[PDB]
């Protein structure tokens, strides 16, 4: 049927009573509940507006760029190691996506990934190069990981993968919720393990937070082509769009610039507000 | 086995009623069987702000003293 | 009839009365409950103490001076040596509990000031070094009933390994980069000295798991801030105590093993 | 096969597209859900929570805790206590509240806004404060005389500690632009002493109040946009 | 006390005992007190933390000027001896 609208306003009139919507006690933890009909005379208004843009599914329904990977296909031997790039999967590489996710403490969603490729020549001289193909392989935590672009793991006998020919539409794939827990945590107030009385008093220093517990594997991305005289540099933009999303606990959004994968602050950015000239400036 | 559902209205839709016209419809077919492949879900405007705006054990009415 | 201000909370072998509370809050509208069979993770036979761990405990008091910038606690941690709750969290690998948090602070009618009491799930705080991230020792991260304090100066050390293992507990950013003014999103109550002398918040267990390991994770933290300064006007330096009293409730444990004894100083 | 034609839009990639993609992990058994307290379904549920306004973010107060404390005195004054422009995603002091930050993800907004003030003075002190809203056609309500010709509430400080003012949705449009403009003027909010705060012997003469802002139930937003507040280097 | 005087005519007694405290200060003054009973055995509650682990009530001073703490009848016997007989230790009552 018709999607439910936001609050309509009834007509009201003057009041002289012991009922007092104007006063409350925010100490109770409750917000004030006053609406215009409680403090001013109002006219009747039918409200047909809906909160659809603001639904969480809508709010998060955008493919954000998360990371950029660099691949280089070159005949120069020192570039062999650059033919292949490994990405540690995270959403923390980009501030807009992590900031939106960090409005919530926990969330559950399925994930859509999109891979957008751009090629150019980093060299001082270009020339003919045949069309390249790229392989995106997902390597789950603990799975064998390649040492080179031409290693044995690329056979992809287990690890799922995508083969993309440059110039076609960007690949897009969907990953079902894969957290071990029943929701992904965006914060973890704890340690990966508990150091005991027989250990160093500074123990735990290096294994605190979400960073020490989550491991989502890596993206092993390589050009699959043989080297050519003219080097091709490829920029791979990895996008994420969470969908079918539920969130379980609101938080203040971060007000300051991020420093790394945790909640760490840089002193140069701990001043989030602009100054005003006066408390009385309109 | 397609599912027909009402479309969100737009610029040329005469009624904000959203129950006028047989044309405000779309058809969805799920092509993949793994549910993660389904397209974005339906709008759900159910809300319960009391969890965050009035989580008070003892119900108080807004017209009464907040504190008796 | 009954007033809203007057209340009695009874759990286990202890009772708390109050004559000046702004009701009580049940976070997110939910009470602590025991895990339903349909959601259980472990297949161990659970331990469910009835009136042992589920009693109120009083944490070491802190003082409210006009120069304090706030106080904080990690919740499971603050009760780690508290009788049976303490012993059970160390004997069992896993445990779960909700809490009743009661904060007390007396003042006369001539005093003014206000304390915001906030309960923050996953209260993750920033390290105090710019050379490392998510860096904090177990010991500094988990101070016990003593809690910690907030400051208004960020003085990280990119060279001193010892200071870097302490938290960068700024008051205005709640130690994590979020303006405190938005802290109100979390369940909270205010001990406004002209209105209340106490606050009570009922806390359900909130996690991604039905049950977790208590020696590793603090499900909730407690943050108390001087939202409005203390003043008396009959002294150059007024002082009132703040005392936090906590009881676990609907507590259960699994995974019985040798008692865990964490690194400590 | 079926004859087809490829219409415009084929092979583009759109950020906001809704189209089925193949599953990466076919037949994956997804970890079952449990109930987790605190479920949020809509961003407006958070918009309706009262959060503090950094009303006093002036030199020496900016980015310190004191920016949230509005001073009050037992002294004679005909001056405004504070002033605010009612533009939630523009005014420097309103933009960073929870309501402000949520609105910084939207292009337009509508509905009424509530301002709640908590007196954090002594119990022995009393007084009356005038809170008001004056729609945009007005010149700035600089004097109490201008403030009292608009929408206003006289707040008697007493047994109940706080008072909520509602600034109704008075507008020449349906939704106002979140971004600052000249056209979508917010209107003015201010406060004056209605009387004076009267303080007895051995009671502090310098009090504070905490202002809060939240969305009303008729509040909504139109289109999603990225927030201007968080930067990133390359 | 009247209870003691009646019990001094008996060799054995049983049942819970109530301790009620009336605050007689000014009306303007406020504060809180901890009233606690510990079962017999172990070391006495010489500080607040140990008193706290026992049976206790927090008394908020206000209009209701009198708080009742009840020492439940926790015992390993049926009746306790009235005499200070170590076979039937009383338990401890403190206020902090
Ligand atoms: C062939 C390439 C497919 C790559 C699949 C990677 C799936 C990653 C799941 C999302 C993990 C991030 C969620 C989180 O940190 O809370």
Author numbering:
A (entry chain e): 17 to 298
B (entry chain h): 2 to 69
C (entry chain f): 8 to 272
D (entry chain g): 1 to 234
E (entry chain c): 97 to 192
What does the paper say about this structure?
Non-polio enteroviruses (NPEVs) from the family of Picornaviridae are nonenveloped viruses composed of (+) ssRNA genomes that infect humans and cause a variety of human diseases. For this proof-of-concept study, we selected CV-A21 viral strain responsible for a substantial proportion of enterovirus-associated acute respiratory tract infections in humans.
The highest achieved global map resolution was 3.8 Å (pAbC1-1), although the local resolution was worse for the pAb-corresponding part of the map. CryoEMPEM maps and corresponding models were used to assign specific epitope contacts for Site-1 and Site-2 pAbs. While antibodies targeting Site-1 are distal from the RBS and it is unlikely that they would interfere with receptor binding as Fabs, antibodies against Site-2 sterically block ICAM-1 from accessing the RBS and may be able to suppress viral entry. Overall, we observed a high degree of similarity in epitopes for several of the antibodies. For example, Site-1 overlaps with the binding sites of 14B10 (15), 5F5 (16), and 2G8 (26) mAbs; the overlay of pAbC1-1 and 14B10 mAb structures is shown in the Supplementary Material Appendix—Fig. S7A.
